[PDB]
Design an enzyme around this catalytic site. Sequence first.
Site, PDB file in Angstrom:
ATOM      1  N   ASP A  48       0.802  -1.218   0.000  1.00 44.68           N
ATOM      2  CA  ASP A  48       0.000   0.000   0.000  1.00 44.68           C
ATOM      3  C   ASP A  48       0.839   1.275   0.000  1.00 44.68           C
ATOM      4  O   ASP A  48       0.277   2.367   0.135  1.00 44.68           O
ATOM      5  CB  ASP A  48      -0.952   0.000   1.202  1.00 44.68           C
ATOM      6  CG  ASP A  48      -0.224   0.120   2.532  1.00 44.68           C
ATOM      7  OD1 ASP A  48       0.998  -0.131   2.579  1.00 44.68           O
ATOM      8  OD2 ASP A  48      -0.883   0.468   3.535  1.00 44.68           O
ATOM      9  N   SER A  50       3.131   2.120   2.260  1.00 40.10           N
ATOM     10  CA  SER A  50       3.703   2.365   3.572  1.00 40.10           C
ATOM     11  C   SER A  50       4.960   1.520   3.769  1.00 40.10           C
ATOM     12  O   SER A  50       5.286   0.639   2.969  1.00 40.10           O
ATOM     13  CB  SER A  50       2.677   2.070   4.666  1.00 40.10           C
ATOM     14  OG  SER A  50       2.453   0.678   4.794  1.00 40.10           O
ATOM     15  N   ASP A  52       7.518  -0.376   6.962  1.00 39.60           N
ATOM     16  CA  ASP A  52       7.756  -0.768   8.344  1.00 39.60           C
ATOM     17  C   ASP A  52       9.183  -0.412   8.739  1.00 39.60           C
ATOM     18  O   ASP A  52      10.125  -0.631   7.972  1.00 39.60           O
ATOM     19  CB  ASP A  52       7.515  -2.265   8.534  1.00 39.60           C
ATOM     20  CG  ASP A  52       6.188  -2.717   7.962  1.00 39.60           C
ATOM     21  OD1 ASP A  52       5.184  -2.001   8.157  1.00 39.60           O
ATOM     22  OD2 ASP A  52       6.148  -3.787   7.320  1.00 39.60           O
TER      23      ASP A  52
END
Length: 129
Positions: A48, A50, A52
Site C-alpha cells: 500500500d 507504507s 515498516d
Amino acid sequence: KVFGRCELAAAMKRHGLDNYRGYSLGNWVCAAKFESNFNTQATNRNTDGSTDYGILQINSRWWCNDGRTPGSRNLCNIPCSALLSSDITASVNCAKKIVSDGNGMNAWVAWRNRCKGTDVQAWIRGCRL
Ligand code: NA
C-alpha cells in the site's frame, strides 16, 4: 545496530516492556526476532506504499511520519527515522501505544504467526535479567 538476544531482552526490560499489557518479555524478543532479526535499521516496504521501520517494524500508515505515505497518520508523533536508532527507546514507547489500542500484540504479523502460542519464554532463557 544488530542486537544480541539477551542484550535486547535486557534493554526491553529496562524500558518497562516485561509483562506490559500482559505480554511477557519473551513475546517482545520473539517478535523482534522475526520482524527485524534484531536489526534496528530494518526497513520493509508494504504493498500500500507504507513502510515498516525499526526493531519492531512499526508501520508508517498509522504510527510514524516518513514523508512519503499519503493519507497516513502519525499516532506516535515521531519521524520514522527515529525508529531506526540504536536506542530502542522510541520504538518501545511507540510499541506501548500500538499494543494498547485493543488488538494487543496481534498488530505484529510475525508475532501472531510465529510467536503466538509458542514457548516464548525460551527466548529469554540463559539471559541474566
Ligand atoms: Na504516517
